[PDB]
Amino acid sequence: TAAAIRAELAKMEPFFPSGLKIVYPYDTTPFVKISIHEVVKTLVEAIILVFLVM
Amino acid sequence: YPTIAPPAVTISASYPGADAKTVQDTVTQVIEQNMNGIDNLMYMSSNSDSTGTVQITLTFESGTDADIAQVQVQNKLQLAMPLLPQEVQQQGVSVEKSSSSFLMVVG
Amino acid sequence: PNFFIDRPIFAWVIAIIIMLAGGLAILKLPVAQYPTIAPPAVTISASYPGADAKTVQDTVTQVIEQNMNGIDNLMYMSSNSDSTGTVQITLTFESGTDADIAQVQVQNKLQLAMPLLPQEVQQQGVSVEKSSSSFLMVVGVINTDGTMTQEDISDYVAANMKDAISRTSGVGDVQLFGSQYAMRIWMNPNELNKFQLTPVDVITAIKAQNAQVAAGQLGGTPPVKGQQLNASIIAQTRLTSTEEFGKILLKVNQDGSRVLLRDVAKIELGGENYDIIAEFNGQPASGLGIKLATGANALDTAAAIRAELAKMEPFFPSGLKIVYPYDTTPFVKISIHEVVKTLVEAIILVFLVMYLFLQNFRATLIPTIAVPVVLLGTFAVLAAFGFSINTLTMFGMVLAIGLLVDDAIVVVENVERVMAEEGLPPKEATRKSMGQIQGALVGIAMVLSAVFVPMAFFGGSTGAIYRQFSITIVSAMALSVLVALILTPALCATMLKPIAKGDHGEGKKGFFGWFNRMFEKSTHHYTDSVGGILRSTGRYLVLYLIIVVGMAYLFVRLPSSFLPDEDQGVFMTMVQLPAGATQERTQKVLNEVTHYYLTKEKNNVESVFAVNGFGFAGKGQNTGIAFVSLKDWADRPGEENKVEAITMRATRAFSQIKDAMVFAFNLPAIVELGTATGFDFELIDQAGLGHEKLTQARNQLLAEAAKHPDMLTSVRPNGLEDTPQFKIDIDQEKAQALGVSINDINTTLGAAWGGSYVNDFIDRGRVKKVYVMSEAKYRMLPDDIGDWYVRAADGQMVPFSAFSSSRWEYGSPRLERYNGLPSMEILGQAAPGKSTGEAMELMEQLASKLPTGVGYDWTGMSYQERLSGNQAPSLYAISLIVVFLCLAALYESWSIPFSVMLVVPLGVIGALLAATFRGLTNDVYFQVGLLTTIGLSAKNAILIVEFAKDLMDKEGKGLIEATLDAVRMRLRPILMTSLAFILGVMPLVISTGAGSGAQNAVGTGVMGGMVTATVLAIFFVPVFFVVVRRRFSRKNEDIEHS
Amino acid sequence: VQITLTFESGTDADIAQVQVQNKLQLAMPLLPQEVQQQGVSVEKSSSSFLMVVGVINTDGTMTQEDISDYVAANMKDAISRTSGVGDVQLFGSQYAMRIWMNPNELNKFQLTPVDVITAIKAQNAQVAAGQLGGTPPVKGQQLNASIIAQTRLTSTEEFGK
Amino acid sequence: TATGFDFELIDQAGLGHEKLTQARNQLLAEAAKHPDMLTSVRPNGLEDTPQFKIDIDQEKAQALGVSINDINTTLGAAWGGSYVNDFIDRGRVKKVYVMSEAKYRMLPDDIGDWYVRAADGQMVPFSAFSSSRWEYGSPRLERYNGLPSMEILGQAAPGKSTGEAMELMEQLASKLPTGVGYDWTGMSYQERLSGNQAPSLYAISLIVVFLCLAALYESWSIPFSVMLVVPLGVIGALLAATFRGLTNDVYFQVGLLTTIGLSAKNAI
Amino acid sequence: TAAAIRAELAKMEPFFPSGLKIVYPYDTTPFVKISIHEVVKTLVEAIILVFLVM
Amino acid sequence: TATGFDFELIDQAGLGHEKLTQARNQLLAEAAKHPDMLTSVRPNGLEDTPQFKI
Ligand SMILES: CCCCCCCCCCCCO[C@@H]1O[C@H](CO)[C@@H](O[C@H]2O[C@H](CO)[C@H](O)[C@H](O)[C@H]2O)[C@@H](O)[C@H]1O
User: Which segments cross the bilayer (chains A, F) (predicted)?
Assistant: First the structure.
């Protein structure tokens, strides 16, 4: 959603006047990315730890 | 998370000037009135602002087809559509598949 | 298949697991009268109060039929245009099409002609409705001391009840017997002529005087700096009372004396409509006709509605008590109760046969315990296919007892006899029997399912019953077979007591066992007969041909049908008053009926519900309706105490001795039956002809439909005849001089003799409508035309009699259209046992005498029944051919299936012989019964044949000798299954109770078919095997390997 | 105006169409009150006409509008109830009451097109009437019948007069 | 909206406009002396603001020759606003608004400065009919299950156990007029269908398990011997839950189940 | 579609006036018939030729 | 159409109809001098007709 929204904005980006900047104050998006990163990392760690025990 | 939360559809109508009790008992309860036999209904809550703008929310059981849920309920409200003032229907009345939480806010 | 027989606790684990999964899956399961059978239809309706037929047909109706262009899965369209102004355009769709979506595209094809529609329609409701035709329940509200009247009850209903007692899910559409309160203002023409005023002035008055108005707010956004007050300006506010409506200013007279609405018109807080009077046993009432939704539960809707209503009781005014008249709910509950009772009786009787054959308790328990696990387990299969425990399914299990006990009994029997043939322990005997009937049982499953599957693939309501049945019994069957492989043998190897070679218990027991002797001897007698007939086969072939011919004959001359008529404890009567009659007289009729029922039928009738102004053929003073409830069947014995004879004597009393036609009767089984051996003729205008042109066409046709003795005479249309229409030509010339405005002339004519929807007020918190109309006496007989005067441009009053040319004419109030053009309906049928298509040919040949612009068409039931039909026997032919081939599969012969299927006639001739004896009909249930009968007969034959073949092939025994021995060994089981079955289905055949016509309709055919099946096949099957086998290679004839 | 909305492939046509139209029945009063009565259509539709059926008269005795009339009167009202059709375009057009104003003869008699508009408007229409014995009648009443009011026109004659 | 719950007060017998509200005041006031249980509890709804009524007298206006349509429309268009038509700004169609100005629509005295041009041509003041006054009125009228009702938002002190705060909101309700009741929505609605579903899940699952073990095996004794091990896996999950300080939520129940899983494996 | 449309029209056929004849300029129907007919022909060709090789 | 495309050139910041139309003139005329890349670049639609203001 954020990628296609980023597209929506970036195609409207070459049409921006003086100092007309974007801000991201309310973002529930990258939290997903980093959360999943840490959970997956945990999974991998479980695997490797199993290997070490074995 | 997955699509966890129940699906709800909301009606909003502009009723300029009018007070709370005016818009609530001419629009709000009057919407939920031909809705006696709603499918997959969890719970129902509709408000009536002092700005005259009504906030009528019908909430459904999760995983019920949003499109289909909207079909049965919007077609249970468009039984009670003349029951709403025909004087409002001039500045747009909107029925929307709607949550309550912003996905993202871009400033 | 074999691996299970050595792990018995594993078997019982599967058993108890699926038995308790069974019971669990039995608890929270939907219960209804029938399943969701009937096709879905959607209707558009628009209100144009006052407007006539030619007006609403040509201002609302036609523009709808013009803007209904782009709907998917559209079958046909049939549109009404009542003289009451309300249009009813019903589109019925392809079966199984998603109702919701069809309705949605239709509704968004409706808002295309919305600004094109009258502005009195645009604000008074246009409705799109998914719709059936029958009320589930009617909840009446009354007052015992008669404190309040009809309109009052109607008010409380529409204010606090018609939405709080319905916070229970499962309702589709209410039609209110009564009307909501409105602000009723009644204009006096003398008191309004006096002050030089018109209805128009009242319109503008109550309009611009009474309203809520857009105000603003103190500190309105955006305010200016420093501002520290924000609050909301209240403006003009809508009204509240009958008081606040009289004191509204119309004009101020010069001297200071004000002119208020209180003066020129009388004002009452009165209902929005006074067209239909809802009278409950003399006592005034108001009702709710609750239609059931397409696909809605039955018993929980009613349980939770009665609970909600009894919980809404602490909100009850003076003497306002609830009554529950039209209730098709407890009939369902009691029906299911009696069907369950039938199950229990069948089970127990089967148990008794089982004991009176095997004579030891722990052996009787073996097929006994087998039954719960097949039933309950089937429920688990049912709870997984997403259908419901109705009548049909439970009846399916009632029939399934026979099948399941058939397989189980066969297994246990062959085991018991094998123990008497070798002497080996339980396990080895079990493996022997299983090894003998493995491919056999798989095959019987295959074939039984091969008779039930091709009935599942047919369409229509019959196909829905067929679906419920097929699924029920097939699932039960697969269950019984997998039980035969897994459950029965594990049971045989264990709990079964072991018997050594050749016991047979002959004369061994005092009380019970004597039978065995009597049985055993007869068996040898029986065998001596079989050989005896295989000795000389010829004569029995002739007798066979005879039997077959008898079957064919008996089958042809048998009455066809669709379903049986049902005494549901609740029926109704319809009332019709002739052209242009009056509410008063119809009220007389309804009260007269209501008297008869609560007078001469006191012991039978419990409550009448006289609803005047509401029929089916149309809306109007001419028609009336009266619902009739009868108390619980516990107090209704006899033949004359039942719905049929009751409506018989009712129609007897209400036809020969009355001035108008009024008929009493009972609703069909479903909610919208196929229209019997007849039809629903749609006569359509195409080339754009008149209304009296089409009416005259209907006259010619209906006159031709009276000119045969070989079809009918004096048949009739179900719809209102031409009512008198009163034309009032305003002459534009004679009016445009006097300075009166045509808009005002019309608006005054309307507002006087029609009515007006102007504004909305706030009664007790609830928004209601504001109505202005004439008064009781100033708008009756035609001379009252004059009494209304139009205030010209200055202030001079012109009478209506100054331009109103008045006259009489004729016009039908019910204006029908079919697919975008004018049309008229004609109900009809054919002579008692006439094929409907033949009547089609006669009516079409009588409609082959019509003027371009007049054509014929078919609608409703007789639409789907018109291009589809003569392929059902082909499908059952498929059943028997597939059975043939499948038997050839499990067997391996293009010849032995001949030998078994030749037995099929012997099963049909008995269902027929049973049908005629009691007097039933070839409906759905008798067709299922027939199928089942063919099934089981074919089973027994299949197994006897199987043993003959296996002996012939794998022990080198010859034809004759092995047929004799197979006959010997597999006779007792045949009788076990058979007797247990007949004695199991017997409780159905002769019972009286809720829907017992159904019970009898299945029972009869099943039983008779079974009787002839067994007690003829057990003498015929060997001859079949013998003569059939004598057409496959010379050598060998009588084999011998070891 | 021709507003074409294209969706992700395989998307269910009906629900998309309605939901779109139920966002169209939001901007309906926002549309001119002269458009709202001149047809708004939402259609599940291909892009190419599947088939075209033409009708002629060899003799000569009629023109486009006549054939087109019989077509749009008896035929172009059913081909949209034969499920699987999106929109028929009549090669021709349906009959209308065509009135063509003479401007000098409209100057002559001190009138405007507006006055003709109001004329044919308020002259030709159906109007809410009533019934003899109107509901609810009073006691003793034994006549119920239907008042006919002004009736819309039919000919070139009834429009001239 | 609030983490934890959405405590829902529901109207049942239709008991007043502020009477029920007074019951709720009683409720939130009774539950306000506990900081050792809950935290930051709040009421959900705008309270009654003062309403400013301005009655036009129809007579005193119909004399002076002013038109009611015009007097109303002018009052509106002055202090409310008007949507009339649409224009075309830079290419995009936008809306057209006409209203009063920053200074002519603030404090009530600006009522006067507006005059209606009568039927002839004389300007009539608002003070010729405008009786003005103050009232009480709630601006936000919200409803729950078809009738007006108002809830109570809140949370709990650090070491957030949700069930104790829920149960506590219910516990200070032991001095309230039944006929005024409690119900659940939002989070603790789903947290309501989570917990009291344990007996259904465990009754179906564990018995089905008993028989399922009983399937490949052949004794009404061995499933006993295996199922007896399950507690020994539970008592440690609990002992871990309380010591660190968590809660019987979803994740802990899944964790529990898994643990039961491994234990049952070993025993098997 | 063509069955229900041509049927729809053919019911309006017994109401057709003087010399009012039909013409079919844009037709995608018989092309289908001949196409499938020739495909079946191809099937047969394959069968018989295969038989010949066999 | 195998080879070919449907170029939708969009105005975003709202500059007019002759701004975009002239841009299209520039593009379609300049992209007509490349035969070694594109072919038959064309407008499919009626060009600006003379409109008669009253
Ligand atoms: C549970 C209750 C008992 C159920 C079964 C009881 C069976 C009773 C059968 C008695 C009837 C005798 O059966 C009938 O007579 C004799 C039997 O020899 C046969 O007829 C035969 O008679 C003698 C026998 O040598 C001649 O060979 C004759 O040519 C041959 O047709 C058949 O005509 C048979 O149909």
Answer: 39-54
